[PDB]
Design an enzyme around this catalytic site. Structure first.
Site, mmCIF file in Angstrom:
data_model
loop_
_atom_site.group_PDB
_atom_site.id
_atom_site.type_symbol
_atom_site.label_atom_id
_atom_site.label_comp_id
_atom_site.label_asym_id
_atom_site.label_seq_id
_atom_site.Cartn_x
_atom_site.Cartn_y
_atom_site.Cartn_z
ATOM 1 N N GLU A 6 37.275 41.253 43.275
ATOM 2 C CA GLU A 6 38.247 41.770 44.144
ATOM 3 C C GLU A 6 39.688 41.062 43.718
ATOM 4 O OE1 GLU A 6 38.518 43.921 46.807
ATOM 5 O OE2 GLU A 6 36.326 44.236 47.029
ATOM 6 N N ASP A 7 40.372 41.406 42.477
ATOM 7 C CA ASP A 7 41.459 41.246 42.019
ATOM 8 C C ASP A 7 41.808 39.592 41.787
ATOM 9 O OD1 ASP A 7 42.419 43.883 42.053
ATOM 10 O OD2 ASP A 7 43.013 43.677 44.034
ATOM 11 N N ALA A 8 40.834 38.743 41.816
ATOM 12 C CA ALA A 8 40.911 37.374 41.670
ATOM 13 C C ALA A 8 40.877 37.011 39.992
ATOM 14 C CB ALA A 8 40.068 36.647 42.280
ATOM 15 N N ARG A 58 41.902 52.516 39.535
ATOM 16 C CA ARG A 58 43.291 52.549 39.100
ATOM 17 C C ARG A 58 43.925 53.179 38.019
ATOM 18 N NH1 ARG A 58 43.709 46.095 41.052
ATOM 19 N NH2 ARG A 58 42.827 46.377 43.156
#
Ligand SMILES: CCC[C@@H](C)[C@H]1CC[C@H]2[C@@H]3[C@H](O)C[C@@H]4C[C@H](O)CC[C@]4(C)[C@H]3C[C@H](O)[C@]12C
Ligand SMILES: [Mg+2]
Ligand SMILES: [Zn+2]
Ligand SMILES: [Zn+2]
Ligand SMILES: [Zn+2]
Lengths: 49, 45, 334, 243, 389, 102, 50, 49, 92, 69, 49
Positions: free
Chosen positions: E68-70, E241
């Site tokens: 989650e984007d970390a 994305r």
RNA sequence: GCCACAGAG
């Protein structure tokens, strides 16, 4: 922009629906002890279960 | 003790009790406090 | 098989399979005589700052342990504390201290002692566990500079503070212990700071020894890594112009065309960085296969200048052995 | 939540729990209240606990389940061409339990050439580690991408690409583990079955084991995306052009 | 999102940034110009004052801490200056002259019995203004202002006390005189910050993310040459994305740094992918930028090729050191006797209507009573049973 | 004098007869756990050897050894440590003789 | 007194070389176009109207 | 025709099959034609005359 | 002219008494921090910084089952994390 | 602001290569891709360290407060 | 036995704040809803909201 | 303290 209206919708829905609860005789009643539903959903079954 | 630097002409100068906050060799009115002489310790990390 | 096969989309057979319980034969038990017979070391290059050597018939776990211990467990000496007197530069004190801590020092780590942390600062640093490096540079305008010049090396006197300005200040018995091996930076041309007239730097750096896990400045190796020996198998002969194309899929010294039969053959698989370019072309499918020997490691240990790479590798092996011995000697608490 | 104390100046939660919060680790800030009375503490931990709230009340489906990078690792373990020897099997089993749980190694799926365990046996051990664990769950479910078999008379498990998952006892006899079987939103998932049949503690234990396994397996078995995964082949640029 | 977050990247401000005294200024110690440029970058002189560093990125799932984007950072890379930054803040005071011919004063240094300054005045100097270059901790004084009480007059002490989670160093002290002939004193304090857990990083294609874990160099994957990635990024950020431009940036940067020239990522043009693939394959690397990495934990070859190369990353101004807050008991408002608002006033977090209603949905009566009465505004009051007042 | 806090035997995970055990070792990481795992799996009596770092913030390593009934897990751990020592000695000897060879 | 916009024709930084920028403690790469009022640098933003 | 051609061990294809992240449509947009852009249910409105 | 804050203005709106101070209000013993992942924690656990944990306190009443534990916490004090920040006596 | 002493990725000392790189670009008129290889910067992580470096110290030193400008 | 146990535990437990649960379970999909254009059974001239 | 914009999810 959708959150601005959705928050007000949720607030209205909760301020209209907060007082209801399932009593010990399986009848859903308001805070003033008036029946909304005689059994919850017609069968008294928890959606969670 | 010389303690202050004129921000324009870069001349080290000191202020007494009755001295105005301005340089003496020029008309600049901005003074920067010079670096202290006391030991400062750092961790090389 | 012990060949890691390289395919166009995946890497196969990457795990070691030498243990009983892999098959019904229950072979490959740990025998120190068999390992002593099979293991091999071949040094191909040995400079004062870089060693290249092949470890043959050893497992991946031990070689990786050697690499990790070399990177982050072999101690080395680097600047740890910096005391500042009149740093008037544009560069901040934190940045200058960090840069001075990042320079490598040509100090044998075995001539020092580990600093006890719980001791107070009045008696923490002694002559046995601290090297003092003094830097003192003042920059002044050059009175006889050329009129048409613009180089700061000619317009100013000390406009470039290098790492060789870190003079060594012996304390106590270091006057006699460090007599024949004075403390100098391993890279004297490291540009530490830039100055202009009116600015001055003066500082004392206390340098102790630590491990690379605590901070990256203590790692004795600039790099320390291995790679498996590449292996190119030509299943069917490749003739003529295609062989020339087959030559262009590899680095220039890897494969060559024989002058007699005009067919391609592998000349030096060590030069082959595995780019698997030959797997792109359909004509070479089912004609060449690529792999890496799983138990054939090519270590390339580059030192930071403090001490020789062979000493670093030996210290890593000794550290692993001492870890095993220390765990063997400890009592097991319930 | 039960509190743990860590030194790194950030609140940390398991990534299986960020789905009810609708949270991503891209700058989210969260709040932490501490109830100051015994009654409030007990009410919070017994009515608002993570274990007691694995299912959303909106529909009854699980909301706390496998998220991204845990579904992918579980799928790669449970892939049909995943075969592990005893060393890799044992390391994977120790990787999901912090080297504490006792594991009863089942007989391998392949015996004569070598001894190889399929990743479905790894997840069978993940659901039920030993004989002392009470978790015995049986289910049949379809994956997200189900390709029906060649003949309509054949059952669903005889399909291509392991579309149908069957768990009998605790062995995973077919299928792969994906968002349909380990993720949220479906009532045939493994964790939903464990929660319904054996209570929330066993479901929490299985989720913790899965998270700890997939947080350490995908690093040692790499998974990457590049432009080679995005560039079209030679003939596609002509078929697309003509269409 | 990149247009939003490019204005928050930490980097060089101007050539006179060290002669400026601004209320808040984030600077980066070692800024680098981007490997993949644009014509707009050259035209607006962004490469003269860049904001970001070229980090070696291995797009792979390393631990569970990149979900989650970390992002996963390298501890050795941070120790060598990657992501190092500094924060400069301004504190200004005016020695106003009151109408009663009385003015504020600055001097004062309470020396102890032995002959040394007290702990609160440890870095305050003889003239009353804190010394340039010394470290100031929480509770110390760097401006010793005193205010006359009647506005031989008596002055009460109204000092300027530094307070914060981390110590800061006095970077600059300036005195001047404003237009109305009142003394103006400005103190610029700097503090050096290194990346930690919670620090926000952006990658110039959106793709924002905080650091989730900081691991050692030997735990990181490595290639044949021994190159260790500085940032490991999760592959799961691409499909939903669709940032193919990020992959093209990685390959263009890799081919440019192997060839020795900066590349162009100009819109509706730029450096073509075929040329960069040719450059990569001439240097002994794969055409698609997918390298073969050995894992640092177990040493074995990874069973998939890892997309490996330089990406320009930006360190955003949002750092966890400025965001963490905790109250317990503290100040309360004079009117409602409830906890104040904001972490600047040691305030409490609001349990609004939605959170109240969520607590209602659980049926927790006692928790609701504790949160909304006991811990916020409980008050014992006397009510008459007859008149109800 | 001996380091009592170095290696511990986690009672709650071991078996009654000592065949299966889990040991907690302080101030180690993968560089020793992986070598111990590889060496111990070469023991013919060991059917389970696996290490784990439960949290990066804790400098700690849990290693689980389950054998058959022939030997206990403690004996397997001691044999693995001795065998790792022998491996390091052999590598040391070969490297130090090939340095002097050239 | 009209507060003048920086780098306009009434400013001191108009058509000035980099040496004069260094003499006035001003960055040559500063875009300009703002007003320094009471020490704070404020920008009059572009307005969009019918 | 794009999805049926991509080989196994294709990372967007794997992530779409799992359901961990993405879908078939995103892969088709990255590799093949992006498709029609729809604004308020219609195509692009006539911004000019 | 800014309109004065009358009695009706103090009661209406999101900043009024009913919606800003009665239905919801600011509370004590709360903290706010950026979140980051940690898969090694169990799903029913959250990791709190030790800096935050030394501020957010829980009032434990001394019983016959936890007297020694709270004695040790009092001895450790406010600075060592397994400690305590305040003590309230029975008769005070 | 100034060339870093060590490469961020591996740890090779590149702080002593800045002056030599500038001299090879200016005096010998070598291209940027060959001057890097002549200095021993083989890995691309070291090449990007001084290829993308912006020497802002020269620009910052024009505003010296200790000496008329 | 299993079927009867699952049925008897699926009843709505007394005291449940079922009105608040319903209010949230209606409001939250309103947050998750994106605004799209629909039409009534295959004819494009309706555009039913 | 009141307004005013600026941002974060
Ligand atoms: C207290 C620890 C001492 C230790 C670090 C010293 C003492 C014994 C030394 C080795 C022997 O000299 C044999 C070799 C000689 C070669 O020239 C360089 C390598 C070589 C392996 C040496 C390395 C190193 O120098 C050792 C191990
Ligand atoms: Mg977010
Ligand atoms: Zn002057
Ligand atoms: Zn009355
Ligand atoms: Zn490098």
């Amino acid at each position: 922009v959708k959150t601005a209206e959705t928050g007000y919708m949720s607030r209205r829905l909760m301020k209209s629906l907060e007082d209801l609860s399932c009593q010990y005789d399986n009848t859903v009643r308001t805070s003033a002890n008036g029946i909304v539903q005689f059994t919850y959903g017609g069968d008294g079954l928890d959606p969670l279960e | 003790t010389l303690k202050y630097i004129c921000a324009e002409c870069s001349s080290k100068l000191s202020l007494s009790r009755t001295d105005a906050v301005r340089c003496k060799d020029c008309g600049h009115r901005i003074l920067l406090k010079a670096r202290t002489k006391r030991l400062v310790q750092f961790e090389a990390r | 098989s012990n060949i890691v096969g390289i395919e166009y989309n995946r890497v196969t057979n990457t795990t070691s399979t030498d243990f009983p319980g892999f098959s019904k034969d229950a072979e490959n038990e740990w025998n120190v005589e068999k390992f002593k017979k099979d293991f091999e070391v071949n040094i191909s290059s040995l400079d004062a700052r870089e060693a290249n050597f092949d470890l043959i018939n050893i497992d991946t776990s031990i070689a990786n342990a050697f690499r990790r211990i070399m990177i982050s467990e072999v101690p080395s000496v680097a600047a740890e504390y910096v005391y500042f007197f009149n740093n008037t530069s544009v560069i901040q004190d934190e940045v200058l201290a960090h840069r001075i801590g990042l320079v490598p020092l040509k100090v044998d780590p075995d001539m020092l002692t580990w600093v006890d942390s719980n001791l107070p600062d009045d008696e923490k640093f002694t002559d046995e566990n601290t090297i003092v490096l003094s830097l003192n540079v003042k920059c002044t305008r050059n009175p006889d500079a050329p009129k048409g010049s613009t180089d700061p090396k000619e317009l100013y006197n000390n406009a470039h503070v290098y790492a060789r300005d870190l003079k060594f200040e012996p304390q106590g018995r270091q006057s006699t212990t460090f007599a024949d091996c004075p403390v100098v930076p391993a890279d004297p041309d490291i540009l530490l700071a830039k100055l202009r007239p009116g600015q001055e730097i003066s500082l004392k750096a206390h340098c102790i020894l630590g491990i690379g896990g605590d901070h990256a400045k203590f790692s004795p190796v600039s790099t320390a890594s291995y790679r498996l020996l590449p292996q190119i198998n030509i299943l069917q002969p490749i003739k003529g112009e295609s062989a020339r194309r087959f030559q262009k899929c590899f680095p220039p010294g890897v494969i060559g065309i024989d002058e007699g039969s005009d067919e391609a053959y592998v000349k030096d698989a060590r030069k082959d960085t595995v780019s698997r370019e030959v797997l792109r072309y359909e004509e070479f499918a089912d004609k060449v296969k690529l792999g890496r020997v799983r138990n054939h490691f090519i270590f390339n240990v580059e030192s930071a200048g403090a001490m020789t790479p062979e000493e670093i590798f030996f210290k890593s092996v000794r550290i692993l052995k001492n870890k095993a011995e220390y765990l063997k000697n400890c009592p097991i608490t319930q | 939540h039960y509190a743990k104390i860590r030194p790194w100046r950030t609140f940390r939660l398991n990534e299986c729990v960020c789905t009810p919060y609708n949270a991503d680790f891209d700058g989210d800030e969260m709040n932490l209240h501490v109830p100051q009375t015994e009654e409030a503490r007990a009410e919070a931990i017994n009515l608002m606990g993570v274990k007691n709230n694995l299912l959303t009340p909106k529909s009854g489906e699980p909301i706390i389940a496998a998220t991204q990078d845990f579904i992918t690792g579980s799928y790669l373990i449970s892939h049909k061409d995943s075969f592990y020897d005893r060393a890799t099997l044992t390391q994977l089993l120790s990787m999901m339990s912090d080297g504490i749980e006792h594991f009863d190694i089942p007989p391998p799926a392949i015996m004569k050439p070598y001894y190889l365990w399929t990743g479905k046996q790894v997840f069978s051990l993940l659901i039920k580690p030993n004989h002392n664990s009470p978790v015995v769950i049986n289910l049949d479910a379809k994956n997200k991408v189900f390709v029906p078999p060649k003949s309509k008379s054949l059952p669903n498990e005889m399909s291509q690409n392991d579309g149908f998952v069957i768990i009998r006892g605790s062995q995973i006899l077919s299928g792969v583990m994906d968002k349909s079987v380990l993720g949220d939103g479906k009532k045939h998932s493994v964790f939903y079955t464990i929660l319904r049949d054996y209570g929330p503690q066993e479901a929490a234990n299985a989720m913790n084991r899965m998270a700890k396994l997939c947080a350490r397996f995908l690093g040692n078995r790499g998974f990457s995306i590049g432009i080679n995964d995005v560039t079209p082949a030679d003939d596609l640029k002509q078929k697309k052009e003509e269409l | 999102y990149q247009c939003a977050m490019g204005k928050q990247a930490i980097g060089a401000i101007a050539y006179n940034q060290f002669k400026r005294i601004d209320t808040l200024l984030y600077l980066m110690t070692y800024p680098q110009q981007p490997m993949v440029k644009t014509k707009t970058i050259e035209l607006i002189d962004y490469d003269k004052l860049p904001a970001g560093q070229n980090a070696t990125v291995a797009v792979m799932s390393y631990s569970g801490y990149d979900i989650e984007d970390a992002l996963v950072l390298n501890k050795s890379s941070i120790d060598r200056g990657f992501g190092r930054c500094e924060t400069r803040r301004k504190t200004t005071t005016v020695l106003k002259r009151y109408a009663n011919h009385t003015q504020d004063i600055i001097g004062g240094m309470r020396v102890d019995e032995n002959g040394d300054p007290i702990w609160q005045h440890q870095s305050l100097g003889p003239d009353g203004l804190g010394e340039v270059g010394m470290k100031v901790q929480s509770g110390q004084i760097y401006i010793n202002k005193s205010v006359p009480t009647n506005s031989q007059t008596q002055y009460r002490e109204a000092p300027v006390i530094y307070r914060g989670p981390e110590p800061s160093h006095i970077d600059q002290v300036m005195m001047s005189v404003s237009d109305n002939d009142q003394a103006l004193i400005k103190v610029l304090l700097r503090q050096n910050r290194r990346p930690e857990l919670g620090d926000k990083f952006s990658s110039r294609h959106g793709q924002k993310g905080v650091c989730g874990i900081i691991v050692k160099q030997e735990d990181m994957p490595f290639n044949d040459q021994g190159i260790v990635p500085d940032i490991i990024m999760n592959p799961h950020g691409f499909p939903s994305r669709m940032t193919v431009g990020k992959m093209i940036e990685l390959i263009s940067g890799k081919a440019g740094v192997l060839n020795g020239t900066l590349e162009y990522g100009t819109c509706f043009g730029g450096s073509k992918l075929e040329d960069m693939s040719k450059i990569l394959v001439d240097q002994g690397f794969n055409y698609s930028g997918k390298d073969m990495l050995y894992s640092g934990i177990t040493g074995e070859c990874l069973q998939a090729y890892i997309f490996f190369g330089p990406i320009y990353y930006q360190k955003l101004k949002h750092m966890v050191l400025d965001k963490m807050h905790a109250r317990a008991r503290g100040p309360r408002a004079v009117l409602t006797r409830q906890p104040t608002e904001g972490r600047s006033r040691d305030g409490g977090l609001r349990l609004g209507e939605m959170e109240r209603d969520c607590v209602i949905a659980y049926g927790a009566s006692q928790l609701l009573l504790e949160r909304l009465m006991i811990s916020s505004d409980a008050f014992e009051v006397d009510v008459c049973d007859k008149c109800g007042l | 004098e001996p380091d009592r806090e170095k290696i511990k035997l986690l009672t709650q995970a071991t078996s009654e007869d000592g065949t299966s055990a889990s040991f907690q070792i302080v101030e180690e990481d993968h560089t020793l756990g992986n070598a111990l795992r590889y060496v111990i799996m070469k023991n013919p009596d060991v059917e389970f050897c696996g290490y784990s770092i439960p949290h990066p913030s804790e400098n700690l390593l849990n290693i689980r050894i389950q054998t058959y009934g022939e030997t206990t897990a403690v004996d397997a751990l001691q044999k693995g440590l001795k065998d790792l020592m022998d491996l390091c000695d052999v590598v040391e000897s070969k490297f130090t003789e090939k340095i002097k060879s050239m | 007194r009209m507060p003048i916009m920086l780098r306009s024709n009434k400013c001191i930084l108009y058509d000035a070389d980099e040496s004069k920028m260094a003499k006035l403690n001003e960055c040559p790469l500063d875009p300009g176009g703002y007003f320094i009022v009471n020490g704070t640098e404020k920008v009059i933003l572009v307005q969009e109207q019918l | 025709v794009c999805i049926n051609e991509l080989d196994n061990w294709n990372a967007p294809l794997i992530m779409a099959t799992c359901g961990s992240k993405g879908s078939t449509l995103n892969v088709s947009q990255m590799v093949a034609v992006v498709g029609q852009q729809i604004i308020s249910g219609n195509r692009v409105p006539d911004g000019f005359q | 002219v800014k309109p004065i804050r009358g009695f009706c203005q103090r009661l209406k709106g999101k900043q009024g008494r009913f919606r800003g101070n009665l239905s919801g209000k600011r509370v004590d013993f709360s903290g706010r921090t950026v979140i980051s992942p940690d898969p090694n924690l169990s799903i029913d656990e959250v990791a709190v910084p030790d800096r935050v944990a030394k501020v957010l306190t829980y009032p434990e009443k001394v019983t016959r089952y936890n007297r020694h534990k709270l004695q040790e916490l009092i001895v450790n004090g406010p600075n060592v994390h397994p400690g305590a920040n305040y003590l309230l006596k029975r008769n005070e | 602001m100034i060339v870093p002493v060590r490469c961020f990725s591996c740890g090779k000392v590149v702080g002593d290569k800045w002056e030599s790189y500038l001299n090879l670009l200016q005096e010998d008129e070598l291209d940027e891709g060959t001057a890097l290889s002549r200095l021993g910067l083989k890995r691309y992580c070291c090449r990007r360290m001084i290829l993308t470096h912006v020497d802002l110290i020269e620009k910052f030193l024009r505003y010296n407060p200790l000496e008329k400008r | 036995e299993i079927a009867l146990f699952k049925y008897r535990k699926a009843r709505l437990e007394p005291g449940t704040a079922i009105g608040a649960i319903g209010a949230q379970s209606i409001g939250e999909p309103g947050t998750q809803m994106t605004l799209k254009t629909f039409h009534f059974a295959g004819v494009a001239s309706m555009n039913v909201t």
